[PDB]
Design a binder for this molecule. Sequence first.
Ligand code: 3C5
Length: 425
Amino acid sequence: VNWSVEDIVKGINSNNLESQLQATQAARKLLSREKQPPIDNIIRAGLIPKFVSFLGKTDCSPIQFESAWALTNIASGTSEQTKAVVDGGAIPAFISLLASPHAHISEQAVWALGNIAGDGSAFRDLVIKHGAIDPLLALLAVPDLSTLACGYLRNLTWTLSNLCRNKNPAPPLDAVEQILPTLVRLLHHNDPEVLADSCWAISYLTDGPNERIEMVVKKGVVPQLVKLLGATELPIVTPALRAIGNIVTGTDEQTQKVIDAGALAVFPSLLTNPKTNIQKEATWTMSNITAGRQDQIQQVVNHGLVPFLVGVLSKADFKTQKEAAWAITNYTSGGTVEQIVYLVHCGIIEPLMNLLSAKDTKIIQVILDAISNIFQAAEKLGETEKLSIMIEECGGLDKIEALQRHENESVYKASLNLIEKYFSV
Ligand SMILES: CNCc1cccc(-c2cccnc2)c1
C-alpha cells in the first residue's frame, strides 16, 4: 500500500514474475484510491502495454486479475484514458479473458469491456467488431438466472446495456438483434439493479426511428415495461418511463400497444410524482399520446387524465408546464369537438391564459396555437362569444393584447389574428 510510481515501475520492469505481481497489485491499489487517483502518471510511465501483456499470462491467474483490475480502473475514467487502454491492445485481451475459468477474472473482463464500450459509439462498435457479444451472451446461457451470483449478473447486464448505448450511429442492427433476446430475459429477472439496467438498455434501443422502436416492440416487452413503470424503486421507474416515452414517439400502432398494456392507469401518480424529472417525462409522454388518433385521445379522457393535465399546467416546474402546453395543443388540434368541449369544462382556459405572461417565446406560440384550435371548435357550436367572455374574465385579453407589443413576429401575427376574429366590433 502507498507505493510510489517509481517503485511500481521498478518492480514491473524486473525480470521476476513475482516482483511484477507485487508491483502490479500495488498499481491497482494506487489506482483504486478514492481521492485524486494518479491515472495519468501511470499512463505516462508506459505501464499500460505491460499490464496488457500480463492479461495473457494464463499460467499466473493472480497477475491476470491484478492487471485487469488496474486497467479497468484506468478505462473507467476519461475518454483520453479509455483511449489509452484501447490503444494498448486491451480489447482482444479482455475478450479472451471472458473465457477464463476464474469467475473473478471473467468478471473483471466483463466490467472492462463495459467501460470501453460505454465511452462512445466508435469504441462500442470496436468492441462489437472484436467479437465480444458471443462470449458475453454465453456467460448467461443457463436455464435459470437465479443460479448465477448476483454481482456477476449485475455486471453482465450493465455491460450489455452499454453495448446498446449512444447514437450517431446507433448500434448495428445485427448486434441489437443478437442481444435483444437475452435482454428480454434480464428484464424479467427479480433484482432491482438488473431491472434498472435492462430498462436503460431498452430505453437506449427505443431512442430512435420507428424501425428500431419496432425491433423492441415485436419482442413483447411493452407489458413488462408498464409493470416496471409501477415499481416503487425510482431507479427502475426512471428508465421504464423513458422507454415508454420513446415508444410513443412512434406510429399509432406502436403507441396503441402502450395503451393496451394498461399504461395510462399509472399516469395519475406519474403526473403528480414528487420527483421533477418523472413528472416532466410523464407529461412529455402524454403530449405524444395526445398527438395520436381520436380514439387514443378518447382513452386519455376515459382514464380521467385530463384533470391531471390541467393540474400540471396550473402548477409545476416550468419545463413540465411547457410539456403540458404541448399536450394541450396536440389534443386540441387532433381532437373532436366534444373532446375539446370537455377539455374546457375541466378548466383549461385559466391556467392556459396565465402561462402567457411567461417570457419564454415558444410556450406562447404553443398556447396561442391551442387557443386558435379551441375557437375553431367553438365556431362549430356558436359558443365563440362565451369563450371570448370566459377568456376575458381571467385576464386573457390583457395578456393577448400585450403580446402585440411582443418583439417576435410569429407571435404578433397570431396574436393580432385572435384579437381581430373574436374580440372586435
Ligand atoms: C406537430 N407536432 C406537434 C408535436 C407532436 C408531438 C410532440 C410534440 C412536442 C414538442 C416539443 C416538446 N414536447 C412535445 C409536438
